[PDB]
Amino acid sequence: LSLTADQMVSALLDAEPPILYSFSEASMMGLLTNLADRELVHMINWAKRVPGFVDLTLHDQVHLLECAWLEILMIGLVWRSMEHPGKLLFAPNLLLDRNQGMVEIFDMLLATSSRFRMMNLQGEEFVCLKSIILLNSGVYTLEEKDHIHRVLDKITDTLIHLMAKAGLTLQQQHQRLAQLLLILSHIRHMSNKGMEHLYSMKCKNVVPLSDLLLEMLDAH
Amino acid sequence: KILHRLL
Numbered sequence: 001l002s003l004t005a006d007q008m009v010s011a012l013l014d015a016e017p018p019i020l021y022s023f024s025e026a027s028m029m030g031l032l033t034n035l036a037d038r039e040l041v042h043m044i045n046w047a048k049r050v051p052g053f054v055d056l057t058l059h060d061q062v063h064l065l066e067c068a069w070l071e072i073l074m075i076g077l078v079w080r081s082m083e084h085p086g087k088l089l090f091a092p093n094l095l096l097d098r099n100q101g102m103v104e105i106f107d108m109l110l111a112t113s114s115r116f117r118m119m120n121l122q123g124e125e126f127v128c129l130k131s132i133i134l135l136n137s138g139v140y141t142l143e144e145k146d147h148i149h150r151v152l153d154k155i156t157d158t159l160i161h162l163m164a165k166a167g168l169t170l171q172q173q174h175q176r177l178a179q180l181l182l183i184l185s186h187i188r189h190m191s192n193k194g195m196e197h198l199y200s201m202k203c204k205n206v207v208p209l210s211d212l213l214l215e216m217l218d219a220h
Numbered sequence: 221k222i223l224h225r226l227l
């Protein structure tokens with residue numbers, strides 16, 4: 001809670017995970033689940049560098065990541081797809097259109113990409129939103145909760161700082177803050193649909209699911 | 221579990 005907004009933004013920028021490389025339907029979802037497993041390991045490293053997160057107990061860290069992991073994967077996928085209208089950039093070597101899709105989720109992901117592009121979402125705003133997803137999505141499921149809300153308030157201050165620096169009026173700042181946070185409702189929705197699809201894949205025992213992903217499903 | 225070991 002001591003960082004400046006600018007130090008907050010630079011801390012989150014430096015913590016960004018790398019972009020990794022990756023057709024039957026058994027084969028495509030093999031690629032997606034294999035990619036998701038590898039991205040999840042890098043996610044853990046990023047989570048440990050989100051300010052405030054290391055202050056939490058290991059069990060609170062586990063709960064928050066178990067709740068938010070697919071939302072975090074999903075907003076990360078939307079963000080790197082933003083400059084590829086109509087397509088999802090799963091990896092630099094896995095750029096997919098909707099006919100290749102799953103389709104219900106694909107369309108929701110494309111709609112979010114389109115919304116981000118219409119708002120001209122900035123990378124500094126994106127890393128704030130990703131950190132909010134991590135701290136918020138499991139907070140509703142006592143000194144520890146107050147710490148998480150104090151950190152969440154700091155990230156809101158940071159988002160507002162960025163829009164002020166960008167020259168937005170107060171009214172525009174508040175409107176854009178609201179537009180950004182409302183998208184998180186849609187990301188929650190997509191993650192719930194993606195989780196339920198991943199449970200169906202687990203049940204039919206065809207797609208190779210890593211131990212790690214399997215326990216993320218168990219947690220849901 | 222695994223996530224514990226990874227953090």
Ligand SMILES: Oc1ccc(CNc2nc(Cl)nc3scc(-c4ccccc4)c23)cc1
Nearest residue numbers: 032035036039073077102105106194197198
């Ligand atoms: O590395 C990444 C890999 C995949 C995603 C978005 N994942 C999906 N995207 C679409 Cl379009 N359809 C479906 S169906 C099932 C899933 C799914 C659910 C849980 C884990 C893996 C896949 C999924 C994001 C990052």
